Design a protein around this ligand. Structure first.
Ligand SMILES: Cc1cc2nc3c(=O)[nH]c(=O)nc-3n(C[C@H](O)[C@H](O)[C@H](O)COP(=O)(O)O)c2cc1C
Ligand SMILES: Cc1cc2nc3c(=O)[nH]c(=O)nc-3n(C[C@H](O)[C@H](O)[C@H](O)COP(=O)(O)O)c2cc1C
Lengths: 106, 108
């Protein structure tokens, strides 16, 4: 009994670096206790995310994530059953480039 | 003027190597440049996300091939989303691959 959820979203046009850092730090905290793992990819106003865990916990955050106003167009979440975890060890691995971080700075 | 965008998420074939990844990018670069396809590829831990932007038909034609590709599977796609402006202009194939992922894909 273990599942994954994959979505693509368009980051708020006004998204700052502070916003990104907040998203990451909350996720770290929640996924940690809530036993979720995965990765968050940001570049140039686009989010990809992969969440994995128990269907219960994923549904929990995914309802929260969708309400979140730091992005929009939260697009066809692809709910796949998984045999094993893919990001064991990463309660939230951010993947954000040096350029992208510079941008969100300006 | 007439730009659409396509997003998908893939599962890398379980025997995918660093060389494979490198082949996927160089092919993409060469092609996307000629086809005016811009976008980004993210790989980590067996997972691929990609965002492609360009004129409707170019996106459509590459996506048929991307889906044929044996180096991955379970290609869940996102209906041609129309876009105001490009987002990765200049980038024909911006790659996201961590140093850790680089280590693993390069093991055996
Ligand atoms: C792109 C994006 C990805 C997010 N991913 C997670 C996540 O994986 N885990 C999580 O707990 N919150 C994530 N969040 C934050 C939640 O949407 C939400 O802000 C928060 O978790 C719910 O309120 P809280 O601060 O009380 O926990 C994400 C937000 C954004 C915009
Ligand atoms: C994850 C992934 C992403 C790919 N992205 C592109 C791309 O954006 N542009 C491209 O021409 N080929 C891309 N390819 C390669 C194509 O699937 C396809 O194989 C190629 O364009 C035609 O065959 P070839 O590899 O022998 O040249 C990608 C392959 C994979 C597995």
């Amino acid at each position: 009994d273990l599942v994954s959820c994959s979505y693509r979203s368009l980051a708020a046009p006004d998204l700052t670096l502070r916003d990104l850092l907040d998203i990451v730090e909350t996720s770290q905290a929640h996924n940690a206790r809530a036993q979720l793992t995965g990765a968050l990819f940001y570049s140039q106003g686009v989010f990809f995310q992969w969440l994995e865990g128990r269907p219960a916990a994923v549904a929990e955050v995914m309802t929260h994530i969708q309400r979140d106003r730091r992005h929009s167009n939260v697009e066809i979440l692809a709910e796949e059953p998984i045999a094993k975890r893919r990001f064991a060890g990463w309660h939230m691995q951010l993947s954000c480039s040096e350029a992208d971080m510079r941008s969100l700075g300006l």
